[PDB]
């Protein structure tokens, strides 16, 4: 139909897939050339990324992520799969890497929690999630629901250069993200005090700083 | 008083020049301060990359390439020199490195052969003309004139060689080679079977693989 299932564009673009013959949120491409080009679509092409409601192969990857049906974006329902991805390479499916996913909260400009659990996850880890002020500089604020953030924000491990508490404190280079916060629990038990992990949000490579039982933030 | 002749800014930016008192394609800077910092300009300063319509001295580098007079960009008229480049360092001129250059088709929405000769050259070298990864093996196996490229080539999705991939995307869709194709000819006759020439496009270093009488591609 007119409205078809898609990922948040950057999920495919980080993967190398910038054009689509059918999906609206990407570059347009003629229906012929899609067979001779790496594209993102709902239909099967030899080199492509196939986005779909159902599963297609065993190597398909389910993503509990932000999504869009046609033009409008929608936030993720946390536990539930939003779409399966299937990376076709030379007319034969390939395994996708591991990655976390942005919830679609940035593009809807919503600063509210998805779950009750995530709300609990916020007050459990206040500094990282809710932010904190420390002598003319903002302390944490790693998430889109955090305070001291500006009215408007871009996308995917967003270095929102600016976090303010008016006439009091400010950090010039604060980094935030709209991923389901309790997805970070597995990385919050390092055997060392500090630990750095190479991760993917929306298939963009980025680091995750963690101090055990104190603070964390994703960082590009 | 003065015309505003200029290179495609990446040419100077790859050379490590970002400011200009006169030329509009760069970061502005006051003429007063032009003495005390490296600039790109049509005038001479103590430290400067001078651009001009004709040669200044023996060390001046003639460039047949895409250019711009003022704000507006022009495609290279192949055969003829577009501008001369003259690097000044502490008053004295310095020999610039050699380089290939981009023709300017990318930033004027063009997909055309500049010459009849270029159309011939692509016919003469079919393995740097059709395909993407089939005949050459860089990720961006694509001249800008290729049928196999998409009609649209926005900088945030495609990696113009000479420049970088724009925006936050991790992997580019491809890499567009927007450069007059017969200018590769000096590197097309190695004495060995394979050769990897260390070369420059717009003074940005890169490797050019050359399988003799077969194919070639920038990396």
Describe the structure.
Chain A: It comes from Equine arteritis virus (strain Bucyrus). Chain A: Residues 4-94 form the AV-Nsp11N/CoV-Nsp15M domain. Chain A: It catalyses: uridylyl-uridylyl-ribonucleotide-RNA = a 3'-end uridylyl-2',3'-cyclophospho-uridine-RNA + a 5'-end dephospho-ribonucleoside-RNA. Chain A: The active site is at residues 127, 142, 171. The structure is a homodimer. By secondary structure, the first copy, chain A, is mainly beta. Chain A has two domains: 1-98, no CATH class; 99-220, no CATH class. Chain A is built from four helices and 17 strands. In chain A, the strands form six sheets. In chain A, strands 4, 5, 6, 9 and 10 form a five-stranded mixed beta sheet that branches. In chain A, a hairpin with a 4-residue loop joins strand 9 (83-88) and strand 10. The first copy, chain A, is elongated. Chain A binds chain B through residues 10, 13-19, 27-30, 33, 36-38, 155-156, 203-205, and chain B through 132, 148, 150-152, 154, 156-158, 168-173.
């Amino acid at each position: 139909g007119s409205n078809k299932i898609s990922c948040l564009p950057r999920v495919a673009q980080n993967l190398g897939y910038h054009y689509s013959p059918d999906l609206p949120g990407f570059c347009p491409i003629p229906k012929e050339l899609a067979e001779h080009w790496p594209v993102v679509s709902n239909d099967r092409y030899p080199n492509c990324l196939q986005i779909t409601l159902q599963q297609v192969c065993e190597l398909s990857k389910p993503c509990s992520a932000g999504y869009m049906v046609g033009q409008s974006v929608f936030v993720q329902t946390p536990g539930v799969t939003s779409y399966w991805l299937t990376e076709w390479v030379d007319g034969k499916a390939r395994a996708l890497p591991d990655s976390l996913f942005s919830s679609g909260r940035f593009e809807t400009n919503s600063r509210a929690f998805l779950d009750e659990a995530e709300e609990k996850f916020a007050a459990a880890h206040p500094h990282a999630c809710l932010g904190e002020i420390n002598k003319s500089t903002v302390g944490g604020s790693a998430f889109i629901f955090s305070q001291y953030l500006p009215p408007l924000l871009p996308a995917d491990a967003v270095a929102l250069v600016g976090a303010s508490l008016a006439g009091k404190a400010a950090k010039a280079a604060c980094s935030v993200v709209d991923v389901y916060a309790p997805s970070f629990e597995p990385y919050l038990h390092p055997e060392t005090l500090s630990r750095v992990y190479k991760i993917m949000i929306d298939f963009k490579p980025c680091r995750l700083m963690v101090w055990r039982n104190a603070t964390f933030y994703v960082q590009e």
